[PDB]
Design a protein around this ligand. Sequence first.
Ligand SMILES: [Cl-]
Ligand SMILES: [Cl-]
Ligand code: NA
Length: 300
Amino acid sequence: IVGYSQNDLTSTERLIQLFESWMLKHNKIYKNIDEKIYRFEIFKDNLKYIDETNKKNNSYWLGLNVFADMSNDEFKEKYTGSLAGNVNIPEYVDWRQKGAVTPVKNQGSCGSAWAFSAVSTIESIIKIRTGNLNEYSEQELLDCDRRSYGCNGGYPWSALQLVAQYGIHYRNTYPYEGVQRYCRSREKGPYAAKTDGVRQVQPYNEGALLYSIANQPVSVVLEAAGKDFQLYRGGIFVGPCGNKVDHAVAAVGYGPNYILIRNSWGTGWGENGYIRIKRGTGNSYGVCGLYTSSFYPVKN
Ligand SMILES: [Cl-]
Ligand SMILES: [Cl-]
Ligand code: NA
């Protein structure tokens, strides 16, 4: 299972056809054949890495996901860098099962995950409090959070606080463009929602984070720039990654061995946009520095 046959490797011509059907499977369109050929070479290299890395018996595996035609350097730059930086709980939690999570979004080639992370926890807390699941505007936070840097990264806590002090509009009222424009908040009329505050989970503390997740999805950060993270396909991700967090995501559950993480790279990444990250190793940073900096919205 995922995402090619051993028969595909026995021949250049086969590799090409494999690459062809992977482009179709992801609606990949390139400028010219020069890029297409370039992309094949990248594809070919990540295939080789995947195939070699999947021999090794870890608890997760890599795959020809949406980022398979990208070099890790290319990937580092474009989908990593969203951070401007600096009591008996259920055995299992998954807020997807309570209707509190909207469908998976795609930040595109924009360092905006700080807004995506925040907005996701906001949508969730309002469902939990008021009973309705809505989609809210990442573009608004992108454009309007003066402490953040738009597509060059920002702070989740800053985005949450904006929503607590002012409000946020609906996705459909302020749609995502993946580019920072001027603030258009006042042009859209009244806010759709307003939170009442922001709290921070005690950092470097797994138990504290789990407790929080059991009440609300939490906005957390991790280091996502690694090639194993990039090509991640399924299973419990156990490393390797450092503690130089560079990406913002939403913790929307956990089990005995893992914390459930909603990413914002579309459904063509990971377990349909999600990753399960190893927990309980005692390590106070968390795998990929997951426990570094966690915030969640408050809604009376
Ligand atoms: Cl520490
Ligand atoms: Cl801990
Ligand atoms: Na969304």
